[PDB]
């Protein structure tokens, strides 16, 4: 999950 979240981390905010 810590890998999942790290990978997704930088992506989450972008489009918002």
């Amino acid at each position: 999950w810590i890998q999942x979240i790290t990978a997704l981390a930088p992506q989450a905010p972008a489009p918002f």
Side-chain angles (χ1 to χ4, degrees):
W1 70 269
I2 193 64
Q3 275 165 261
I5 206 168
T6 287
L8 293 165
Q11 303 185 267
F16 294 92

